[PDB]
Design a protein around this ligand. Structure first.
Ligand SMILES: *O[P@@](=O)(OCC(C)(C)[C@@H](O)C(=O)NCCC(=O)NCCS)OP(=O)(O)OC[C@H]1O[C@@H](n2cnc3c(N)ncnc32)[C@H](O)[C@@H]1OP(=O)(O)O
Ligand SMILES: [Zn+2]
Ligand SMILES: [Zn+2]
Ligand SMILES: [Zn+2]
Ligand SMILES: [Zn+2]
Length: 531
């Protein structure tokens, strides 16, 4: 085994102890909570032959005070590792209700407040031990990066370092203050994801809205369509032989699906807080799907700042989507207000343990207020539930109900092969919404090929394998960081550049510093730079 780091930071025993032990003392000062932890657990005093079969690496205050007085701690992380070992043993062996388990959780909250500022004055990120949430006995550990100058190990998520963005490796912020050099800018930002008129309309509408409240904690919101492609939904086998072969419905229906995300600036970095896939059935689509939009999936992570504006901003995006597609020529929109089953995440891979999953009544009230806001603001003319809408229009055939990919109704009808259906319809009236917005539809936006966002499964899968959780602010920041690198570097679109004036292909060009995407053939009112 070969090794080397010449200007590494090494701590002499007295330095660590003088810094670290004021934290070990705050644990001892907890009475009675520290008392079962001041000496090694003795199973023969306590009556637990169990213990050493269950706890393989015992640890306690006295042992830590010994190592800290002997100098057995080379780096500060070895000290912190040993206290969390102490806490983790107790949390493990004892049941979550026991006294000692609660003693431990008091000691741990005390350690957490004490160790963070200390480790940061010693030049580290924090003094926590982090593990990722459980997957399908052991848990996977958060990752570390070493500063190429210090050698001091840091949490990659704490410092938000990624070699793809900064390929010359991780250099700590303090070593950069002596370095003279600041960190170089992350060019893989949300703002810098390719813009679109759909994306632009949504973010432009929300930011003036956030402005009208003018809360000081709020940051900028970026809305980006990150995928678009042309698909078809195949009629399932039962309804197929009963209606397509007869020629009453088309065998497949074309639609354009789009995946879009919103990001907020929080602590000067991008945080993804909202995501949605939609299906858009244009004006050349045969009945019953002609000129319809459907919200396939809507997902969210509650870290928008401030909390008191979070939902209002979700409504603004949704309300904004309807205004946009109405303008392009769509006539009706549809929402299936269904809360996720089990602990299944629609779009984001690990929601906060304490983000409430709403009751369907809550979910339906939510949409109810959402649509009402749009009617009032003169964007929606009206909206009804499927029954008041379906037979107010007097549908009597199953083929007159819109037929959308992955929607409930194609499979209620598909099982109904052997077998009443109007009764199946009446049971769930409230969860299924029909939204009334009111010359071909022309999407002015180009297609974005992005397999990662081609439907909701690809991003869920990649985030589970790579542990991009959205379970905390710090993890969402990291997951967003990497999500954005994936969109920037592994999308599947290649870019041809054309001069906005001469329709010609350009390589060398003058690009406008102000305009959305403006280039001129070398052969204009704005300052231009050569690219
Ligand atoms: O914060 P919200 O606007 O979020 C709405 C969302 C639909 C975006 C959200 O629930 C989400 O991300 N859902 C993902 C999957 C899904 O359901 N998709 C369906 C698309 S139609 O408002 P909420 O409704 O989430 O919550 C607002 C407050 O209500 C509390 N709350 C929610 N669920 C609760 C349950 N089961 N029990 C009790 N309270 C519940 C939340 O805590 C929120 O209260 P605060 O005071 O803000 O904490
Ligand atoms: Zn850390
Ligand atoms: Zn450093
Ligand atoms: Zn210009
Ligand atoms: Zn030109």
């Amino acid at each position: 085994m070969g090794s080397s780091q010449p200007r590494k930071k090494i701590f002499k025993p007295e330095e660590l102890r003088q810094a670290l032990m004021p934290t070990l003392e705050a644990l001892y000062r907890q009475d009675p909570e520290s008392l079962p932890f001041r000496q090694p657990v003795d199973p023969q005093l306590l009556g637990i032959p169990d213990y050493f079969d269950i706890v393989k690496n015992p640890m306690d205050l006295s042992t830590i005070k010994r190592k800290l007085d002997t100098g057995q701690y080379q780096e500060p992380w070895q000290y912190v590792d040993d206290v969390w070992l102490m806490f983790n043993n107790a949390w493990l062996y004892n049941r979550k209700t026991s006294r000692v388990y609660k003693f431990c959780s008091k000691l741990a909250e005390v350690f957490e407040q004490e160790i963070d500022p200390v480790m940061q004055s010693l030049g580290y990120c924090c003094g926590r031990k982090y593990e990722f949430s459980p997957q399908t006995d052991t848990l996977d550990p958060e990752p570390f990066v070493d500063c190429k100058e210090c050698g001091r190990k840091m949490h990659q998520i704490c410092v938000l370092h990624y070699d793809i963005i900064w390929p010359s490796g991780f250099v700590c912020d303090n070593c950069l203050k002596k370095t003279g050099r600041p960190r170089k800018e992350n060019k893989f930002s949300a703002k810098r994801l390719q813009t679109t008129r759909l994306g632009n309309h949504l973010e432009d509408r929300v930011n003036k809205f956030l402005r009208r409240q003018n809360h000081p904690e709020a940051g900028e919101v970026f809305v980006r369509v990150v995928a678009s492609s042309d698909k078809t939904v195949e009629v399932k086998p039962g309804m197929k032989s009963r209606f397509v072969d007869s020629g009453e419905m088309s065998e497949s229906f074309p639609y354009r699906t789009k995946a879009l995300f919103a990001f907020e600036e929080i602590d000067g970095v991008d945080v993804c807080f909202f995501g949605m896939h939609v299906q858009e059935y244009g004006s050349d689509c045969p009945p019953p799907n002609t000129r319809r939009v459907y919200i396939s999936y809507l997902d969210s992570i509650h870290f928008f700042r401030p909390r008191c504006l979070r939902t209002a901003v979700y409504h603004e995006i949704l309300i904004g989507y309807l205004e946009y597609v109405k303008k392009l020529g769509y006539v009706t929109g549809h929402i299936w207000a269904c809360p996720p089953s089990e602990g299944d995440d629609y779009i984001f891979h690990c929601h906060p343990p304490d983000q409430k999953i709403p009751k369907p009544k809550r979910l339906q009230e939510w949409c109810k207020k959402m649509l009402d806001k749009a009617f009032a603001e003169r964007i929606i003319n009206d909206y009804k539930d499927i029954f008041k809408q379906a037979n107010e229009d007097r549908l009597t055939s199953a083929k007159e109900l819109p037929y959308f990919e992955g929607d409930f109704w194609p499979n209620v009808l598909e099982e109904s092969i052997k077998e009443k259906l109007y009764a199946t319809m009446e049971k769930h009236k409230e969860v299924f919404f029909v939204i009334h917005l009111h010359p071909p539809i022309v999407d002015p936006d180009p297609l974005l090929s992005c397999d990662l966002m081609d439907g909701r499964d690809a991003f869920l899968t990649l985030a589970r394998d790579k542990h991009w959780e959205f379970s905390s602010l710090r993890r969402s920041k990291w997951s967003t960081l990497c999500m954005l690198v994936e969109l920037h570097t592994q999308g599947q679109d290649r870019f041809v550049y054309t001069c906005n004036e001469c329709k010609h292909h350009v390589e060398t060009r003058w690009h406008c510093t102000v305009c959305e995407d403006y280039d001129l053939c070398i052969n204009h009112t704005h300052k231009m730079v050569k690219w």
